Design an enzyme around this catalytic site. Structure first.
Site, mmCIF file in Angstrom:
data_model
loop_
_atom_site.group_PDB
_atom_site.id
_atom_site.type_symbol
_atom_site.label_atom_id
_atom_site.label_comp_id
_atom_site.label_asym_id
_atom_site.label_seq_id
_atom_site.Cartn_x
_atom_site.Cartn_y
_atom_site.Cartn_z
ATOM 1 N N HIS A 1 -25.233 -25.727 22.019
ATOM 2 C CA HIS A 1 -26.333 -26.586 21.628
ATOM 3 C C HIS A 1 -27.598 -25.666 21.763
ATOM 4 N N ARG B 208 -0.586 -20.175 10.005
ATOM 5 C CA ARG B 208 -0.069 -21.343 10.884
ATOM 6 C C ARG B 208 -1.577 -21.678 11.814
ATOM 7 N N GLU C 205 -16.284 -30.822 13.923
ATOM 8 C CA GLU C 205 -14.673 -31.068 13.780
ATOM 9 C C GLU C 205 -14.383 -31.664 12.498
ATOM 10 N N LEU D 255 -8.243 -17.714 7.846
ATOM 11 C CA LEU D 255 -7.375 -18.544 7.155
ATOM 12 C C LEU D 255 -6.024 -17.954 7.252
ATOM 13 N N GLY D 256 -5.266 -18.396 8.153
ATOM 14 C CA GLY D 256 -3.732 -17.946 8.339
ATOM 15 C C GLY D 256 -2.849 -18.995 7.968
HETATM 16 C C1 HFQ Z 1 0.082 -29.124 17.854
HETATM 17 C C2 HFQ Z 1 -0.563 -28.662 18.986
HETATM 18 C C3 HFQ Z 1 -1.877 -28.503 18.918
HETATM 19 C C4 HFQ Z 1 0.185 -27.628 19.908
HETATM 20 O O1 HFQ Z 1 1.351 -27.553 20.343
HETATM 21 P P1 HFQ Z 1 2.416 -27.122 19.449
HETATM 22 O O2 HFQ Z 1 3.310 -26.117 20.304
HETATM 23 O O3 HFQ Z 1 1.985 -26.206 18.245
HETATM 24 O O4 HFQ Z 1 3.453 -28.129 18.919
HETATM 25 P P2 HFQ Z 1 4.174 -29.356 19.940
HETATM 26 O O5 HFQ Z 1 5.611 -28.749 20.150
HETATM 27 O O6 HFQ Z 1 3.352 -29.271 21.485
HETATM 28 O O7 HFQ Z 1 4.276 -30.771 19.177
HETATM 29 C C5 HFQ Z 1 3.218 -31.595 19.637
HETATM 30 C C6 HFQ Z 1 3.409 -32.917 18.909
HETATM 31 O O8 HFQ Z 1 2.809 -32.684 17.596
HETATM 32 C C7 HFQ Z 1 3.799 -33.461 16.529
HETATM 33 N N1 HFQ Z 1 4.253 -32.486 15.673
HETATM 34 C C8 HFQ Z 1 5.165 -31.412 15.572
HETATM 35 N N2 HFQ Z 1 5.374 -31.104 14.239
HETATM 36 C C9 HFQ Z 1 4.749 -32.113 13.723
HETATM 37 C C10 HFQ Z 1 4.776 -32.472 12.089
HETATM 38 N N3 HFQ Z 1 5.426 -31.417 11.110
HETATM 39 N N4 HFQ Z 1 3.866 -33.267 11.644
HETATM 40 C C11 HFQ Z 1 3.327 -34.152 12.398
HETATM 41 N N5 HFQ Z 1 3.566 -33.972 13.711
HETATM 42 C C12 HFQ Z 1 4.153 -32.835 14.457
HETATM 43 C C13 HFQ Z 1 4.942 -33.398 17.422
HETATM 44 O O9 HFQ Z 1 5.819 -34.480 16.827
HETATM 45 C C14 HFQ Z 1 4.770 -33.296 18.722
HETATM 46 O O10 HFQ Z 1 4.798 -34.736 19.514
HETATM 47 P P3 HFQ Z 1 5.795 -34.632 20.611
HETATM 48 O O11 HFQ Z 1 7.085 -33.668 20.704
HETATM 49 O O12 HFQ Z 1 4.922 -34.655 21.650
HETATM 50 O O13 HFQ Z 1 6.349 -36.168 20.631
HETATM 51 C C15 HFQ Z 1 -0.601 -29.863 20.031
HETATM 52 O O14 HFQ Z 1 -1.016 -29.298 21.314
HETATM 53 C C16 HFQ Z 1 -1.282 -31.070 19.799
HETATM 54 O O15 HFQ Z 1 -0.547 -32.008 19.050
HETATM 55 N N6 HFQ Z 1 -2.718 -31.282 20.264
HETATM 56 C C17 HFQ Z 1 -3.321 -32.464 19.734
HETATM 57 C C18 HFQ Z 1 -4.037 -32.413 18.360
HETATM 58 C C19 HFQ Z 1 -5.208 -33.318 18.049
HETATM 59 O O16 HFQ Z 1 -4.930 -34.355 18.526
HETATM 60 N N7 HFQ Z 1 -6.425 -32.680 17.743
HETATM 61 C C20 HFQ Z 1 -7.645 -33.708 17.513
HETATM 62 C C21 HFQ Z 1 -7.359 -34.553 16.269
HETATM 63 S S1 HFQ Z 1 -7.318 -33.657 14.650
HETATM 64 C C22 HFQ Z 1 -8.827 -32.816 14.156
HETATM 65 C C23 HFQ Z 1 -9.791 -34.079 13.954
HETATM 66 O O17 HFQ Z 1 -10.616 -34.721 14.662
HETATM 67 C C24 HFQ Z 1 -10.032 -34.377 12.445
HETATM 68 C C25 HFQ Z 1 -11.377 -34.756 12.003
HETATM 69 C C26 HFQ Z 1 -11.850 -35.189 10.776
HETATM 70 C C27 HFQ Z 1 -10.628 -35.012 9.762
HETATM 71 O O18 HFQ Z 1 -11.204 -35.428 8.389
HETATM 72 C C28 HFQ Z 1 -9.525 -34.467 10.127
HETATM 73 C C29 HFQ Z 1 -9.288 -34.170 11.375
HETATM 74 O O19 HFQ Z 1 -7.810 -33.543 11.631
HETATM 75 C C1 HFQ Z 2 -34.262 -25.606 26.026
HETATM 76 C C2 HFQ Z 2 -32.802 -25.067 25.806
HETATM 77 C C3 HFQ Z 2 -31.986 -25.656 26.713
HETATM 78 C C4 HFQ Z 2 -33.073 -23.400 26.007
HETATM 79 O O1 HFQ Z 2 -33.670 -23.037 25.220
HETATM 80 P P1 HFQ Z 2 -34.013 -21.306 25.041
HETATM 81 O O2 HFQ Z 2 -32.659 -20.613 25.633
HETATM 82 O O3 HFQ Z 2 -35.188 -20.903 25.665
HETATM 83 O O4 HFQ Z 2 -34.029 -20.909 23.542
HETATM 84 P P2 HFQ Z 2 -35.393 -21.314 22.585
HETATM 85 O O5 HFQ Z 2 -36.515 -20.113 23.283
HETATM 86 O O6 HFQ Z 2 -34.994 -21.000 21.245
HETATM 87 O O7 HFQ Z 2 -36.067 -22.693 22.964
HETATM 88 C C5 HFQ Z 2 -35.548 -23.449 21.649
HETATM 89 C C6 HFQ Z 2 -36.771 -24.612 21.769
HETATM 90 O O8 HFQ Z 2 -36.711 -25.442 22.854
HETATM 91 C C7 HFQ Z 2 -37.596 -25.668 23.279
HETATM 92 N N1 HFQ Z 2 -37.914 -25.479 24.675
HETATM 93 C C8 HFQ Z 2 -37.729 -24.493 25.625
HETATM 94 N N2 HFQ Z 2 -38.044 -24.925 26.908
HETATM 95 C C9 HFQ Z 2 -37.739 -26.366 26.766
HETATM 96 C C10 HFQ Z 2 -37.925 -27.318 27.669
HETATM 97 N N3 HFQ Z 2 -38.113 -27.274 28.968
HETATM 98 N N4 HFQ Z 2 -38.320 -28.656 27.155
HETATM 99 C C11 HFQ Z 2 -38.477 -28.929 25.759
HETATM 100 N N5 HFQ Z 2 -38.160 -27.969 24.888
HETATM 101 C C12 HFQ Z 2 -37.883 -26.712 25.290
HETATM 102 C C13 HFQ Z 2 -38.457 -24.225 23.094
HETATM 103 O O9 HFQ Z 2 -39.816 -24.338 23.174
HETATM 104 C C14 HFQ Z 2 -38.011 -23.986 21.746
HETATM 105 O O10 HFQ Z 2 -38.728 -25.072 20.983
HETATM 106 P P3 HFQ Z 2 -39.915 -24.537 19.635
HETATM 107 O O11 HFQ Z 2 -41.290 -24.427 20.502
HETATM 108 O O12 HFQ Z 2 -39.487 -23.202 19.299
HETATM 109 O O13 HFQ Z 2 -40.144 -25.755 18.612
HETATM 110 C C15 HFQ Z 2 -32.470 -25.229 24.482
HETATM 111 O O14 HFQ Z 2 -31.410 -24.280 24.019
HETATM 112 C C16 HFQ Z 2 -32.231 -26.655 24.169
HETATM 113 O O15 HFQ Z 2 -32.998 -27.250 24.008
HETATM 114 N N6 HFQ Z 2 -30.758 -26.749 23.387
HETATM 115 C C17 HFQ Z 2 -30.540 -28.092 23.067
HETATM 116 C C18 HFQ Z 2 -29.777 -29.057 24.233
HETATM 117 C C19 HFQ Z 2 -29.354 -30.149 23.697
HETATM 118 O O16 HFQ Z 2 -29.862 -31.105 22.688
HETATM 119 N N7 HFQ Z 2 -28.016 -30.791 23.874
HETATM 120 C C20 HFQ Z 2 -27.246 -31.732 23.529
HETATM 121 C C21 HFQ Z 2 -28.261 -33.197 24.078
HETATM 122 S S1 HFQ Z 2 -28.192 -33.281 25.756
HETATM 123 C C22 HFQ Z 2 -26.256 -33.584 26.294
HETATM 124 C C23 HFQ Z 2 -26.000 -34.854 26.039
HETATM 125 O O17 HFQ Z 2 -25.415 -35.060 24.883
HETATM 126 C C24 HFQ Z 2 -25.889 -36.054 26.857
HETATM 127 C C25 HFQ Z 2 -24.865 -37.180 26.684
HETATM 128 C C26 HFQ Z 2 -24.727 -38.305 27.333
HETATM 129 C C27 HFQ Z 2 -25.853 -38.512 28.649
HETATM 130 O O18 HFQ Z 2 -25.604 -39.508 29.405
HETATM 131 C C28 HFQ Z 2 -26.937 -37.343 28.780
HETATM 132 C C29 HFQ Z 2 -26.694 -36.269 27.847
HETATM 133 O O19 HFQ Z 2 -27.878 -35.259 28.256
#
Ligand code: HFQ
Ligand code: HFQ
Lengths: 136, 136
Positions: free
Chosen positions: B89, B110, B63, B107-108
């Site tokens: 993942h 809106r 993001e 790239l649109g």
């Molecule tokens: C805009 C939507 C996405 C769609 O709904 P919609 O139908 O299209 O529009 P709505 O009628 O529902 O209006 C909703 C609200 O929006 C406001 N607004 C309107 N026009 C303007 C304007 N010209 N200017 C300013 N604001 C405007 C309105 O005032 C309105 O407020 P209220 O009427 O409620 O008082 C809405 O669902 C939304 O804001 N979701 C949250 C988005 C979000 O927080 N994403 C995650 C965070 S961003 C990503 C990130 O993490 C990130 C990371 C690193 C980095 O470098 C950079 C990064 O961005």
């Molecule tokens: C193991 C999969 C899930 C399935 O794999 P697949 O479909 O078979 O695909 P591949 O055949 O290509 O395998 C690829 C590689 O993986 C190895 N491998 C296979 N089986 C096992 C095994 N049993 N054990 C170990 N390794 C295994 C394979 O041998 C192979 O390795 P290599 O020999 O090639 O070097 C794999 O997609 C994966 O690990 N994704 C990432 C998951 C992840 O990190 N999610 C985010 C973090 S967890 C969520 C979180 O954030 C979180 C937050 C808070 C909290 O409280 C708690 C939280 O959990």
């Protein structure tokens, strides 16, 4: 209850110490029979450069709650990892804390699906997320 | 060349100071004519409790790169916000830094669609993500 692992809120919160969960001040506040709830602040640790809660930070909260919920639905030495995560950013947040509520959509033998909704302090939905886990 | 805003790598990195981007030491390392690249450490700030890179941390990177690329493809007082995000993942990251490479899919006027792939230090794909933005 859906849980297979018994854990206290204290012990659940201790899991985050010294990792990202702890660093973002993510706090688990309620363990329901079939839900899990945690909050996270909106501040410099979790904002994007234009003053909003970073979209990624919302997803960190969702994946944190959903993954540990998933973990708690396995037993013994089973592990749970996030496989796929998605989210819609429906409303921005700028201050305070947000609150994520996690419920199961699927609890399978090898995969799970979790729904996490994240609300601001007014109970307004800010992020709707779905997480698919893999049980290893 | 897709960019509409001209920015230096230094100024791009300056954007992250005082927010989550800087907090996590996310560093932008290359601005291409149609790509943007940033890295992020795998350490206590971005790991989950069992030692892996947190799934959400990968999405923070995706993001962060995709949203600012989106911003850099707008002009003036236009704003860009994350609307929808998904991420696979496919491999765990455990150490070092991961590297995110962002490319435009659409790239649109809106909306934009950005692809972000995140690789480990050995060049293996760990996260594949798609970000949809809205231009305001
Ligand atoms: C805009 C939507 C996405 C769609 O709904 P919609 O139908 O299209 O529009 P709505 O009628 O529902 O209006 C909703 C609200 O929006 C406001 N607004 C309107 N026009 C303007 C304007 N010209 N200017 C300013 N604001 C405007 C309105 O005032 C309105 O407020 P209220 O009427 O409620 O008082 C809405 O669902 C939304 O804001 N979701 C949250 C988005 C979000 O927080 N994403 C995650 C965070 S961003 C990503 C990130 O993490 C990130 C990371 C690193 C980095 O470098 C950079 C990064 O961005
Ligand atoms: C193991 C999969 C899930 C399935 O794999 P697949 O479909 O078979 O695909 P591949 O055949 O290509 O395998 C690829 C590689 O993986 C190895 N491998 C296979 N089986 C096992 C095994 N049993 N054990 C170990 N390794 C295994 C394979 O041998 C192979 O390795 P290599 O020999 O090639 O070097 C794999 O997609 C994966 O690990 N994704 C990432 C998951 C992840 O990190 N999610 C985010 C973090 S967890 C969520 C979180 O954030 C979180 C937050 C808070 C909290 O409280 C708690 C939280 O959990």
């Amino acid at each position: 209850m859906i849980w297979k692992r018994k854990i206290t809120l204290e012990a659940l919160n201790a899991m985050g110490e010294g990792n990202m969960v702890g660093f973002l001040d993510i706090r688990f506040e309620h363990i329901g029979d079939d839900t899990l709830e945690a909050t996270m602040p909106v501040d410099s640790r979790t904002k994007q450069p234009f003053g909003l809660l970073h979209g990624g930070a919302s997803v960190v909260l969702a994946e944190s709650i959903g993954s540990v919920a998933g973990y708690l639905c396995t037993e013994g030495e089973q592990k749970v990892v996030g496989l796929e995560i998605n989210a819609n950013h429906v409303r921005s947040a700028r201050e305070g804390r947000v609150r994520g509520v996690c419920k199961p959509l699927h609890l399978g033998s090898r995969h799970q699906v979790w729904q996490i909704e994240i609300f601001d302090e007014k109970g307004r939905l800010c992020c709707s997320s779905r997480l698919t886990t893999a049980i290893l």
